[PDB]
Design a binder for this molecule. Structure first.
Ligand SMILES: *[C@@H]1O[C@H](CO)[C@@H](O[C@@H]2O[C@H](CO)[C@@H](O)[C@H](O)[C@H]2NC(C)=O)[C@H](O)[C@H]1NC(C)=O
Ligand SMILES: *[C@@H]1O[C@H](CO)[C@@H](O[C@@H]2O[C@H](CO)[C@@H](O)[C@H](O)[C@H]2NC(C)=O)[C@H](O)[C@H]1NC(C)=O
Ligand code: NAG
Ligand code: NAG
Ligand code: NAG
Ligand code: GLU
Lengths: 66, 61, 652
């Protein structure tokens, strides 16, 4: 519900793994449609490379299982 | 509008939280009263020139 | 030694049609030296067709055949497929009843019909239904053969879609000459769906439409959709067809016979040319019916495979393995008031463009009816509240939770016949409010932007912008960032404000502390002139002009524009104070990297007013919309919209 997430910008980048449960969760939601559209353009192939990108600072935030 | 004035004037009391039902005060008349528009126009004019600012400053400090 | 035969079967002026050209100099633009041959089947009976085709094959040894006949034909497509299976000659049927698609075709046969299957027509019709948001339709069907395939296609297309279609009921009829008339009449008086889809032959279509006219299913409260089969000669439609009938056809619509013949010969010539480029030689000529070449002759299979995928004059002529046109551009045509088949929309690639943003409906007396519950809403782009985007190219349409909107059609962007309007998608706070109002008050609406001025200012006694559109009855209501003020409330009516706002001051991080400060009221009081300005032609400018003459006379120097540009000029240092709307200034402060601040902690909003929904003076919708807005404010939906649309980063 943070306004940085709900109001996306080219500058901010957050994404999740492609074709996963989080992808489905954001697809189903209608009030999260803008977030899904922003996320889909930068979605990652796997979780480990997503962690490496986060440590790299290429990806600001990573949404994944707890 | 009333609670904030009471808290400011009488002190010793505090208002908590943010406003959870935003509305306005309005002049009430019978249904389909012919001179509604008049009053509404006047009220809008009072908002435009200076009248509501003076009324706020003079009464609700 | 390439030889291409054209067979004319149309029962009109066939001799005038065969004689039309019967030449070899034609088809010059082609990557080949055509050698045509007109045989013109005289009457298109099975014996005549078989005998003439066999004689042609046993005399000229043609490489391919192009067939053409009239639209009343029913069973010739079977005979042509039979001939192609028996002699292994590639035929190509163009126009007439021979161009209806047969789905299973004699596996070893190259028929290659130049028509579109039933499923693609169903897809186009369902996308037409999606465009105007028509649901709860009913299906009318006769006992015409292939109706099971039609129903299965309807069910598959309805099931495999993102929208939630809702079929009401399917009714089967006889629609035969001289039979039970009470049964059809009784069944037709029991349907109440607003959208009806029918599937039958030409004569059955005429019978059904006559019965429906007797049953009161023709007026403006009923829209009919039919596939190609129900249509006949498009040039002369019958009187039984109701005005507003919708169908979907290929580009061959409105083309002349010679053009169709040229296109077929071109397809065959390009297939042969590709075969020659690939194998260095021409394909073998066809044999004769007094034999049976059991072996598949892989040379002929290769020729057929080359003939499948071929393009000509920028149009795709690819054929499905089922021998019909795959992914062709199709046009959606409708029967207008003049009782002519006007073309309405197009189906280029997987996306749909349609001429009419709203479907017209005419009375039973051909009198244009306008639905009283369809409101025309004018609006304008304002980043916090109204956002316009281009539709997603991938899916044709755009993302849900985004209402389609059109741009003003004053300037025609048709470029021929594509679309006279720019189709965008609008979203945001005001559009969400409008959607909630449409759900609650139960009305339908379109949405178009205003390209004639900003929100509105009286110039030379006339009004431009949204106020101009509403006052001059071009639109039912105006929604957006419209401030309630006396000069507008006198000329038009206003609804209850749904978000409060006013005049506010923006500075780069409390030097002024008041709109009526001596710095503003007296520009030349001290220091070189204060560089403060505002966007002209708005409520703020008129308020300043009518109240503080010195303020307005100084503000003329700094006539800012494009509030984002004013904001960036403030950031750079070309400006030190910006006078504008409080609702947008709070949002602009919220999503600021430097976190610009409004003059006083709460901005000390001056001339407090609100955003309203403009309406025509003394209208009817006013009371209902006022009550609906008050209900929305009462139930906390407006607070939810504030949280989801006007949140800020450093506002807390
Ligand atoms: C609202 O105010 C307007 C003034 O702008 C009133 O209009 C005048 O009304 C009087 C008597 O009703 C007339 O003699 C004047 O000729 C009107 N002026 C104009 C310019 O038309 C209006 O009547 C008021 N509304 C009501 C219900 O009294
Ligand atoms: C139609 O498609 C066929 C194949 O589906 C194309 O023929 C191929 O052409 C490429 C050229 O690089 C060859 O490598 C393949 O071996 C060919 N395949 C076959 C089965 O012939 C043909 O070129 C296409 N038509 C056009 C006009 O491009
Ligand atoms: C073909 O039709 C013409 C006139 O339409 C007729 O004169 C001719 O005899 C016909 N040929 C046949 C039936 O073989
Ligand atoms: C329509 O467009 C023309 C430009 O072709 C321009 O004068 C103006 O935007 C419009 N003219 C009107 C509304 O008279
Ligand atoms: C404001 O109106 C003036 C005069 O009509 C015009 O020249 C100016 O371009 C307008 N400013 C806008 C539309 O931002
Ligand atoms: N809401 C304002 C637009 C901003 C302004 O010009 O003050 C109006 O409709 O007048």
């Amino acid at each position: 519900n943070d306004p940085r997430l709900r109001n996306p910008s080219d500058k901010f980048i957050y994404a999740t793994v492609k074709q996963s449960s989080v992808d489905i969760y954001f697809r189903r939601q209608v009030e999260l449609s803008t977030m899904y559209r922003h996320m889909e353009k930068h979605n990652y192939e796997s979780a480990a490379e997503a962690i490496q990108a986060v440590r790299d600072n290429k990806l600001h935030a990573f949404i994944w299982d707890s | 509008a009333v609670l904030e004035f009471e808290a400011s004037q009488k002190c010793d009391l505090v208002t908590t939280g943010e406003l959870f039902f935003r509305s306005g005060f309005g002049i009430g008349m019978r249904k389909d009263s012919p001179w509604k528009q008049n009053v509404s126009l006047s009220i809008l004019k009072s908002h435009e020139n200076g009248f509501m600012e003076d009324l706020d400053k003079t009464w609700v400090r | 030694a390439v030889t291409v035969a054209v067979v004319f079967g149309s029962s009109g002026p066939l001799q005038t049609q065969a004689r039309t050209r019967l030449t070899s100099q034609n088809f010059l633009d082609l990557p080949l030296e055509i050698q045509p041959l007109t045989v013109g089947v005289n009457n298109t009976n099975p014996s005549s067709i078989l005998t003439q085709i066999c004689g042609l094959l046993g005399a000229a040894r043609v490489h391919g055949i192009v067939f053409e006949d009239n639209v009343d034909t029913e069973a010739v497509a079977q005979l042509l497929d039979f001939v192609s299976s028996q002699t292994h000659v590639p035929i190509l049927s163009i126009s007439g009843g021979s161009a209806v698609v047969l789905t299973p075709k004699e596996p070893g046969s190259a028929f290659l019909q130049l028509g579109v299957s039933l499923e693609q027509q169903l897809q186009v019709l369902f996308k037409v239904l999606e465009e105007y948001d028509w649901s709860a339709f009913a299906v009318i069907t006769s006992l015409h053969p292939g109706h099971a395939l039609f129903l299965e296609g309807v069910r598959a297309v309805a099931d495999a879609s993102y929208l939630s279609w809702r079929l009401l009921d399917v009714l089967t009829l006889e629609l035969g000459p001289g039979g039970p008339r009470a049964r059809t009449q009784r069944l037709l008086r029991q349907v109440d769906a607003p959208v009806l889809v029918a599937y039958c032959s030409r004569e059955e279509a005429e019978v059904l439409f006559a019965e429906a006219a007797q049953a009161g299913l023709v007026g403006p409260g009923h829209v009919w959709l039919v596939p190609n089969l129900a249509l006949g000669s498009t040039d002369a439609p019958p009187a039984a067809f109701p005005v507003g009938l919708i169908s979907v056809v290929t580009e061959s619509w409105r083309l002349s016979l010679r053009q169709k013949v040229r296109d077929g010969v071109a397809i065959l010539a390009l297939g042969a040319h590709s075969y020659r480029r690939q194998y260095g030689t021409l394909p073998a000529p066809a044999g004769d019916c007094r034999s049976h070449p059991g072996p598949v002759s892989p040379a002929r299979e290769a020729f057929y495979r080359h003939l499948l995928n071929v393009t000509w004059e920028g149009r795709d002529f690819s054929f499905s393995p089922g021998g019909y046109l795959v992914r062709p551009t199709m046009v959606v045509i409708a029967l207008n008031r003049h009782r002519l088949w006007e073309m309405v929309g197009r189906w280029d690639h997987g996306v749909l463009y349609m001429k009419y943003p709203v479907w017209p409906r005419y009375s039973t007396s051909l009198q244009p009816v306008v639905d009283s519950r369809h409101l025309t809403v004018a609006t304008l782009e304002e980043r916090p509240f109204v956002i316009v985007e281009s539709p997603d190219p991938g899916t044709g349409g755009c993302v849900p939770n985004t209402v389609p909107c059109r741009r003003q059609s004053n300037h025609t962007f048709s470029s021929g016949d594509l679309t006279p309007y720019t189709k965008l998608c609008c979203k945001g706070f005001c559009i969400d409010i409008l959607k909630k109002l449409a759900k609650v008050v139960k009305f339908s609406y379109d949405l178009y932007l205003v390209t004639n001025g900003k929100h509105g200012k009286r110039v030379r006694g006339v009004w431009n912008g949204m106020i101009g559109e509403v006052y001059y009855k071009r639109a039912d209501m105006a929604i957006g960032s419209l401030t309630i003020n006396e000069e507008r409330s006198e000329i038009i009516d206003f609804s209850v404000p749904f978000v409060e706002t006013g005049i506010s001051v923006m500075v780069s991080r409390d030097t002024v502390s008041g709109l009526s400060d001596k710095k503003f009221q007296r520009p030349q009081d001290q220091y070189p002139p204060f560089r403060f300005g505002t966007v002209p032609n708005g409520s703020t400018e008129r308020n300043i002009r009518s109240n503080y003459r010195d303020m307005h006379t100084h503000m003329v120097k700094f006539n800012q524009r494009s509030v984002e540009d004013a904001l960036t000029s403030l950031k750079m240092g070309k400006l030190d104070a910006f006078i504008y709307d409080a609702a947008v200034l709070n949002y602009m402060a919220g999503k600021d990297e430097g976190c610009k601040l409004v003059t006083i902690g709460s901005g000390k909003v001056f001339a407090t007013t609100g955003y309203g929904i403009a309406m025509q003076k003394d209208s009817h919708w006013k009371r209902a919309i006022d009550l609906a807005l008050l209900q929305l404010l009462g139930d906390g939906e407006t607070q939810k919209l504030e949280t989801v649309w006007l949140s800020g980063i450093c506002q807390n």
